[PDB]
Design a protein around this ligand. Structure first.
Ligand code: BOG
Length: 273
């Protein structure tokens, strides 16, 4: 069953015990129903099932962002399609396996360019994901989801890093906001004392929790970026460069400085830690 998607932020990234990666709540909800249900007829049937799952995923993603056609939505479409890809192609880092065996007993157990099969049609799966929204907007529909960037095949590690980047850059002003709202004091307050006092202390340590799991996540995922190329190698090198390419304003310095709690704001508001 593909259930209604939970709000982004309700469950942060999950770096499971003893694992090579960190997974988002966006994929734990990824519609994989018709896949985990099951000549050329086989490939056609799997194609249709994937059409169903992709369409439902698109619809539930639209519902997830309160029926708002925007950048976050397009991003989620991109990630979902990519993950669908690594599922089909079988190059998924993530840990079921009933679809990894179903899609195996339907095609091949030696060399498997199901690669090309996905390549032959992923555009169509994409229109399947974009189906709901476009059928809802009708004539009023416009293309704000840049297509060939969305269809361009890339190792998920990359995709998940971009997604994580958007998540972090989206959560940061919120956390800084609530921290500042519960710690900021007038210029004649000793902010050390305010920091110690319960209200600002709890908030500061909550911030600490958030930035701690943020650094843990980025650690695992970056070690994971450097994990792959070595093993895989074969279009960018600086893991950060990906992040440099994702959002409008990103400098490495401020980032490292933020996740290592060497932040100016954090060190000013809560110095009692
Ligand atoms: C010389 C150092 C004295 C510092 C006094 C800072 C003035 C604090 O004063 C307060 O600042 C608030 C805004 O920060 C205002 O909203 C308040 O009306 C004001 O009482």
């Amino acid at each position: 069953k593909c259930n209604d998607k939970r709000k982004r932020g309700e469950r942060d990234w999950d770096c499971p015990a003893e694992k090579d990666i960190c997974i988002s709540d966006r994929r734990y909800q990824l519609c994989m129903k018709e896949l985990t249900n099951l000549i050329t007829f086989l490939k056609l049937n799997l194609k249709r099932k994937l059409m169903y799952d992709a369409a439902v995923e698109g619809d539930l993603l639209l519902k997830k962002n309160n029926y708002q056609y925007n950048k976050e939505f397009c991003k989620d479409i991109r990630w979902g399609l990519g993950d669908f890809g690594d599922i089909i192609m079988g190059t998924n880092m993530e840990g079921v396996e009933n679809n990894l065996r179903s899609i195996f007993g339907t095609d091949e157990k030696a060399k498997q360019d199901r690669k090309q099969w996905w390549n032959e049609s992923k555009e169509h799966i994409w229109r399947a994901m974009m189906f709901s929204l476009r059928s809802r907007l009708k004539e009023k529909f416009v293309w704000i989801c840049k297509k060939d960037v969305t269809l361009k095949v890339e190792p998920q590690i990359y995709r998940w890093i971009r997604e994580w980047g958007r998540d972090y850059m989206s959560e940061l002003p919120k956390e800084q906001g609530k921290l500042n709202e519960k710690c900021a004091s007038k210029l004649y307050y000793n902010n050390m004392a305010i920091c110690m006092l319960p209200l600002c202390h709890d908030a500061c340590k909550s911030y600490d929790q958030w930035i701690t799991r943020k650094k843990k996540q980025w650690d695992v995922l970056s070690t994971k970026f450097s994990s792959v190329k070595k093993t895989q190698k074969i279009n960018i090198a600086t893991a950060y460069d990906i992040l440099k390419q994702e959002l409008n304003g990103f400098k490495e310095a401020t980032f490292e400085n933020e996740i290592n709690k060497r932040d100016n704001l954090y060190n000013h508001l809560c110095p009692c830690v």
